[model samples]
Target: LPADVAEELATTAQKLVQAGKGILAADESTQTIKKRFDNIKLENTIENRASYRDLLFGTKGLGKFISGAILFEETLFQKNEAGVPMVNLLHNENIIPGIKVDKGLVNIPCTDEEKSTQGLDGLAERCKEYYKAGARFAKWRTVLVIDTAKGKPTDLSIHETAWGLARYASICQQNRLVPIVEPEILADGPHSIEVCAVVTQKVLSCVFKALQENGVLLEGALLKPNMVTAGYECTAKTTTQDVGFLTVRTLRRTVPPALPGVVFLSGGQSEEEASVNLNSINALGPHPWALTFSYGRALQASVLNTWQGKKENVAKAREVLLQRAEANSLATYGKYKGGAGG
Candidate 1:
C-alpha cells in the first residue's frame, strides 16, 4: 500500500459515509452495456460511450443524490467533450469516482465448469495506477446461484467469490480505494423465495468472514448485494413486501452495522418493478445497514432511451436522469411512489 494511496482511501470512505444517500452504478460490462445501447439502436462506439456517459454525468444536481459512481474500466479513462477526465468532472461535482477492478468471470478448469472472478494477477499494481489517475474506490463482482440443481453456489464458487471480494476490498482500501464488494446471486433459476433467502444469507456471511480474514476495515468499505427474492422462474412470484422483508432480515443477521451503507443491484427486474420493490423494502424495515440503490438500468435505461444520442435532446435526457435519480433518492428514504415527478 503506497502512502499516498492509503491516504486517498481514507478521504473517499469518509465522503461516502456522509449523512445520507449512497452510490450509483453505471459500470455495466460491455455486453450488458451494449444491450442498453441496442434498445435505441445507437452506435455503441467509443464516442457513443463518452457521449452517453457524459449525459449521465451531466445529469442535473446528480451530486445531491449520488455520492459516487462505479465506473467500468473504459468509462473510467474516457473523457468528456471538454477534454477533462471524467473523474475530474465527477470530482468537480463532488461525486466520488470509482473503478471496477475485477477482470470478469471465467470458467475454472474442473468441477462442472463453474467459474470464478479473476483479476488478482496484478490488481495491486493496477489499483495503484488507477489511484494515481483519480479513482478513489474500486469494485469487483462475484456471481452466485440458488443451487437446488447441484447446489449451484458450489462451495468452490461461494468461498472463491467471497475471498476474491475480500481480497479486492482489502487491497483497494489499502490503496485508499474504498472497495464496493459485490456478490450477485443470480435469479435465473426455479428456486423458491426461501431458497433465495437462505443462499443470500450464507453468501453475505461468507463475504464478511473473508473480509475479516483479509483484515479489511468495515468502516472504509461498502456492500453491494442482490435482493433476496424468488428466482425469476419460480412457480410463484413473491410480493415486493415479502421479498423486502426477507432481504432485510438476511442482511440484519449477517452484514455488519459498521459499514456505511448497503446499495442494492437490480439483478434483472424491469425498471419500474425494481424501483417499486426497492421502495417497498426501504418502507418495510429498520434495516441495519443504510438500504439504498446502486442501480444501472433501474435508473438510467428509460432516460438513455429517451436521449437516443441526440444533443438536441440533452434537456430531456437530463430531465429523465434527474427524475430517476430523484426517484431513487426518495426510494432510499422510503418515500418514492409511482411517478412522483409526473
Candidate 2:
C-alpha cells in the first residue's frame, strides 16, 4: 500500500464530499445505462461512449459543483479527439476521476428475486491499475429494497452487501484510491418514507460493521447512499422538507461521526425534486455525514434530453448541465429554489 498516496486520497475524498458540494454520478451500468443512450438515440458504441462522456466532462465549468465523477470501465480509459485519456481530461478541469468497480448483481441462490453484488475477483489489481490511469477513487453500489412495512430487513442480504462493499472499500483504500461505499436502498417500492428510513438505517448499520471488521478507515472513504423516502407507490408522499429532515435524522442514527461525508443517490426523483430535497437535507444541520447528492438522472436527464446527441446542441447541453450544477451547488448550501428553467 502506498501510505503517502492513501493520505492524499483521504484528504481529497473528504474535500469532495464536503457539505453543499456533492458528486455528479455519471457512472451507469451497461444495460440500464442505455436509457441515456436511447434518449439521445445514439447507438451504445465505443466511440459513442467516448463522445458522450466527453460531452459531460468537456463541458466548461463543471468542477464548480461536481467534485468527483463515477465512471464505468470503458469510459475510464477512453480518450478524447486528441487521444488524451478521459481521466486526464477531468483532471485538467480539476475534477477527481473515479471508477465503478462492482460487477452488477447476481442471483441469490436461496432468495426470492434478491441478488448479491459480484466482482470481487482480482479487484485489487484493477484498483491499482485505475489509480495509475489517473483515478483517485472508485465506487461500488449495493442495492437494497424495503418491501414490507413492518418486515425487518433481510439479515443475509444486508450482511452480504455490507461485507462486499467493505471489502471493495478496503481494497481501494489499500491501493490509495478513495472508495465511495454506496449501499443504495431504492425509492421505488410501496413502503412509506419511514420504511425507507428504517431499511436505510439497517443497511448503513451493516455497512459500517463490515467496514470496521475489514479494517477500512471510515474517514478515508465516501459514503453514497439513498435518502430516506417513501416508495413511489405509497399513497402518502412526504414533502421535501420532511424527507430532508427524516433523512438527516436517519443518517445521524446510523452513520458514524468518523465518516467524512455522505453523498446521496437520487433513486428516480425528478431533478427539481431531488435538488429541493437535497437543499432541505442540508437545512437540517449538524448531521454525521455531508448530506449531499451523488445523483445520476437528477443531474443528467434534462441535459441529455436537451442535447439529443447533436453537435449543434453542445451549447444547449452545456447550458443545461451548468444550470443543474449550479442548482445542486446552491442546494448544497440550502440556497437552491428551482427557479431556473429552459
Candidate 3:
C-alpha cells in the first residue's frame, strides 16, 4: 500500500471512533423499516421515510456525538423539503455520510437453515458512485445465527462470511471509501453468555485472518460486532457488567491492535440497556481499540415513537434523538449516569 493511501485510511477510521463519538447507523432497508413504522400505525411512504430521516439529520448538536451516519441507498440521493441534499446537510454539520451496500441475507445451501449475505456483484461501481455523491464510508452486514442444539454456525458459515466481508472491505478501500465490516452474530436463541463469547471470538478470528488474506487494510476498517450477551430465550440472565467484561475480554483475545475501533450493534437491546452496557465496557477497558456504538433501533425507537409521522411532533422527535445521542456519547467515556428512556 502507498504510504499516502494508508495514511488517508487511518485518518478516516480514527475520526469515526474518536473519544466520545460514534457512528449512527440509520441505514435500514425499506422492507425492514416498514416493520418499525407498522409499530406506530404509520404507513411506509417515501415521503414519511424521508421526513423521519430529515428530523434526525437536522437535529441540532448531533455532530457533537455522531461522527458519521450510514444511509440507505435511497437516502444518499434524497433531498430535504427545502431541496437541499441530505448529504449536504450532513456535511454542513461536519458529519461524514456513509452508505449501506449490502442487499441483504439469503439462506446458505446444504444446511437445515443457515444464512449468507448477498450484494458483492457490482459493489465497486456502486462505491464509486456513492463517493461521488458525498459518501466517504460504506457498511455491509452478514448475519450469523446460533443454535447450540442444532450444531449451527458451523465452520463453513464462519469462513464464508469472513470471505464475503473481506472482499467487500477490499473493494471499498480501492474505491476510496472506508468500510465498516459488520459480521453480526444474532442474539435470537437460548444460549448462555459464555456460548455467545466463544462464538464471537471465533468469528472475529476468522474475519481478521480472511482480511489479511484479501489484503484489506486493518487500520482503515471499522468493526461493527454484536456484544457478547445471553440469548433472548435464555432462562438465566447476566448483568450489564457481565456482558461488558466478556465482550472486552473476547475482543482483546481475537481482534488485532491495528484495527482502529469496535462499534457495537445494539441488536435487540433497549436504548437505556445499550447505553448502560456500553458505559460498563468503557469503564472496564484499557482495551486497544475505541469501543463505541453503531446503532439503529436502539437510537431511533424513542424518536419514532415521538414522531408518529406527525409534522407537529418533529421538533420533539429531534429532541429525543439528541438526548439519546448525548447519553451514548457519555457512555463512550464511562460518564453516563443513566436517566433516559426509549
Off by over 4 Å in 2: 1-6, 149-152
Candidate 3 structure quality by residue, lDDT tens digits, 1-342: 777767888899899999898888889889988999998888999988888888888887899989999999999999988887889879877889999999888988887667788889999999989999989889999989889888768888998899999999999988888889999999999999999999999999999999999999999999999999999998896999989999999999999999999989999999999999999999885778999999888899999998989989999999899899999999999988889763
Off by over 4 Å in 1: 1-11, 17-20, 340-342
Candidate 3 — what's its lDDT? 0.90
1-342 in candidate 1: lDDT tens per residue? 555755565566657645445677888778878888888888778888888878887775888888888888888888988897777778777887888899988875665667689898899899988888778888898887776878678888888888889888887776667888999999887898888889999989999999999988787788889998888888795788887888888988998877767888888876777677778888975766678778888778777778888888878878888777777777777887878443
196 in model 3: Cα distance from truth in Å? 0.4
TM per candidate: 0.93, 0.95, 0.98
Q: Model 1, 146: alpha-carbon shift in Å?
A: 1.6
Of 2 and 3, the candidate ranking higher by lDDT: 3
lDDT of 2: 0.81
Error of 2 at 261 (Å): 0.4
TM-score of 3: 0.98
- Rate residue 228 of model 2 by lDDT: 81
Global lDDT of each model?
Answer: 0.81, 0.81, 0.90
lDDT of 1 at 1: 55
